Amino acid sequence: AHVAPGELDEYYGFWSGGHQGEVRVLGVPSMRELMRIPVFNVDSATGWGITNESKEILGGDQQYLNGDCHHPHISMTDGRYDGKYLFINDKANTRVARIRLDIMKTDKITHIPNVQAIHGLRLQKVPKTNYVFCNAEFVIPQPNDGTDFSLDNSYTMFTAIDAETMDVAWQVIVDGNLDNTDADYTGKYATSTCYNSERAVDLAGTMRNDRDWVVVFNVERIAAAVKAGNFKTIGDSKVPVVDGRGESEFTRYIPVPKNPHGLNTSPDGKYFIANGKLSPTVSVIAIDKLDDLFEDKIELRDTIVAEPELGLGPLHTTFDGRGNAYTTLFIDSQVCKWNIADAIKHYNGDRVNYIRQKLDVQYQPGHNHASLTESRDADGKWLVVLSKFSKDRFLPVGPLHPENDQLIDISGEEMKLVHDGPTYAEPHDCILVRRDQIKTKKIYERNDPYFASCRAQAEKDGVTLESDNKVIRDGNKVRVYMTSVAPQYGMTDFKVKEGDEVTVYITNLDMVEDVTHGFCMVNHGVSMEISPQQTASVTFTAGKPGVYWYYCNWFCHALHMEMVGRMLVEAA
Amino acid sequence: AHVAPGELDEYYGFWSGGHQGEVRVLGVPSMRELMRIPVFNVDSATGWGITNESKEILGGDQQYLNGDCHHPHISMTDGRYDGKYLFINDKANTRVARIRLDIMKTDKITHIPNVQAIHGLRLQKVPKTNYVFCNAEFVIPQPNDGTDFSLDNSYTMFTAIDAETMDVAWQVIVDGNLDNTDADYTGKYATSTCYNSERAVDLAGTMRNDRDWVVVFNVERIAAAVKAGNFKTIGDSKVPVVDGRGESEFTRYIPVPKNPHGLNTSPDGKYFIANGKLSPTVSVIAIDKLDDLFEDKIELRDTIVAEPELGLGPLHTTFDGRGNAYTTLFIDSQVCKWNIADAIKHYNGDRVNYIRQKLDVQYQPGHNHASLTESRDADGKWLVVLSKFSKDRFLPVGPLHPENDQLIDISGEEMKLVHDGPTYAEPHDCILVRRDQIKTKKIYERNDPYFASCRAQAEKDGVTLESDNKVIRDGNKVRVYMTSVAPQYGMTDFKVKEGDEVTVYITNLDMVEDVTHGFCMVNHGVSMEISPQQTASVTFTAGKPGVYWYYCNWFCHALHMEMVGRMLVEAA
């Protein structure tokens, strides 16, 4: 539970950043932040959102200075974390991102078409992560061209993204909306909760029905239908779309108690658990009974194997791999450990007690996460509870309070609070992985994708990134290529004309671990990272004529303050 | 050294964010991050840099998505922290910010004229903080208009800003350049180190002279000159400028060993210590002899009371108020604890040993900080060393490694490492203040300056922010006012035309601490924080026609997911 100087943490903790936009890498159990991976935010340090490389990844036809990421998930191979990728959603601007875990950098960014607010997101587990499943939370007209604002004709869709290409594979139109989602351990099924079957906007209308549902998607059927060419296209997108509304061979709507929120798959792979929220219950769906349900051999609610009452406001559930479940109670402000088997029995008529313990969590719990819970290897050692209010938990810091993610020891019979972790800009879910499930690199290979465009442009200009220090003029454009080692840039002076579009390419020749350099052009709003053997580039417009210094902003040597240069801008 | 769940830290830690741009509030000794104060960066969560209130403070005639802050400092009254303000520099885009500690929010941002790269920054101690002292590191021509790029005619200036106004008071032209700075405990003197007395750009040139210097500013004489109107102006700035180059009544250049970096004032108020960097020494200037020096009664070097050899790469120094100093040795990678009195004796010819202890610090130490070291009340209990490399200290996370700020117990006669705190995007210096020296507010007053502009616009529109939910049309401009409580916005639908400049004002009526709300408009790159009793606005351009949902991104209630609305954009 304690990590001293010189010792290392056992698990990596990938924390969603919420509406702050980044992904935070913490070490567990110390609970310290080890790194920040910019994603939908603009990082002033590494220059993510500023550098050309990052802007090419972000794409889009408009620059977004924000994002809202909630659900980080790691790629899998046969129900086990393989550590290659980490995917996460953007509810603010309808995007999904992919992070390269070998270097901890956003790799791909995709815009989901004809849909709005990507919220729920999870990956396929078996045979491996071929599909990234995403939920669009808000219903809108199809197409959303402004010719019909009515909620009557507003719908949302379920989106499947090809994990290796990050291109959308297909979308499934559904009824109501989509909140959270999860997949099984076969690859055939995926499911999502719904809280707005009423497709209303006002509160009163979204709480109307006593029950909403859990939509089950038959990925096998859906994929077949798309392969056979039986699909349509919406708007200007070419993405294959299938209809999963009403009586469809692609979907099954299992009614669930009021505005269900979380939806979690158990490690054993036989239960999809929907969280009640408005209903003080949880709904346990049997994945084993799904085949018959899609064959109309049984009734919709026959898939329900249990629906135990736990407390007020259940939002998310996680598992210890020992048959117990842990659910957060928002309103009662606590986490509840209960036995699934006992819940199955109690549901059938028994009197067995299924609730084993209730631990008071410090102010309104949201997501819940137990180590390796999303894999066959759920070890039941650690449980993280991410609360939404910190009230008096930490020193006062103004009207804006931090969130409080508490580390709880669940390796034993009883839950024991171990650490109170203050956090910024509301994280939602998080995922822990064993130190050995990730294979990190320390220095870049010169053919790395993260700067393939840089050498492509270099080849055209006839420059050798690893040794040249040239200035190339191309009309109003000016490309400057520099090299960096020790406390010096391969170039300490260059001239351009006011208004010129200047691009600077910095290639870091140092090969010693942790010897990172930076580049910052004064009064030009430019900054970027250049770790060992990397090439990064940033373009800006030269300001009014005069002298503008540039310097390394990454302390790299005793002569760091001196790692400088001057850009001379003359009247055009 | 340990803070258990439920307990509180003893000191607040205000960490600089380096080129990441923000200020970080940590609790000591837990070393946990309690809050992030956006300053020069753009926060996707609170909306700093996106909201109208922040953009108004940011000012400027250009948008900057980046910043580089190194030195956070807290206002004082008679040499003691008074907890009213925190000031920090921006080296990337030449600015200085001010933070209101009552709400932990940036309150003022000033662009410094005719100068570049604000680095060193520190406050006046006695009688109180009236002046904010800033160093500009890179020499530029005066004025910088592109008619003469030569280094021969490039210079920099020492800037004093009025703390309460945040308007530049005056500037002092100097020879060489300016690195770091500190002030005495009387109000008469301020001093800065210089590493480029050669005013060169190439590495070898900046190291040419055996000695550089510490420039001492007679503030008393500089203010007198300004009051009498004996000053000039440069370029478009009306700021008073005095010449401190060569033989001046305003300045005194005390030669100090090779490219000195840090410059710290001892708690007893009698020493200005310059760190030798390229020289394995430290230079102790007696502030007591400064009066005679500005009267030419003594020689420049006569002010030097000690110049002890400590190790390779001394960068910064701090004190325990017990007569001992602690210096970081960048190259030898360690912190050195030496007695100041003994160094004085040794310099006089004695044989006494001044070095008490050398503690290996984990990889290249930068800034150094002892609790309350900048005030008369230096308690000498905690020491924070902020290193630039972490290497094997934490779990691997890619080519980019985190920094390592180590907490050291110094209350005893022996330094003892206690904690290894990983940190993102290079923080430089930090300041620790007692829990009781900070008086924070939990909710806003409806007359808070932070939204004065909002209610001034409200008045003109004849709207009562605390109870109105109206849509005021102003040609192509549309001002939407909404109220907010529990899980609902006071409005759930409004219309505008494609291309309309929409400004959404949100007022949070809840009175319960920690009950914060947010606002985000899907696909419009907008997000903002609205804490208890606060009003905030954000303006954007209505995109193409169609439906666009807006929602609360600050988990505030069990019905948080439902706290939404719809903006309908119709073809113009």
Ligand code: CUZ
């Ligand atoms: Cu925070 S939802 Cu978005 Cu995940 Cu419970």
Ligand code: CUZ
């Ligand atoms: Cu800017 S320097 Cu030793 Cu302060 Cu980092």
Ligand code: CUA
């Ligand atoms: Cu490169 Cu500092």
Ligand code: CUA
């Ligand atoms: Cu207001 Cu969530």
Ligand SMILES: [Ca+2]
């Ligand atoms: Ca409902």
Ligand SMILES: [Ca+2]
């Ligand atoms: Ca909160």
Ligand SMILES: [Ca+2]
């Ligand atoms: Ca020098």
Ligand SMILES: [Ca+2]
């Ligand atoms: Ca570093």
Ligand SMILES: [Cl-]
């Ligand atoms: Cl979930």
Ligand SMILES: [Cl-]
């Ligand atoms: Cl300093």
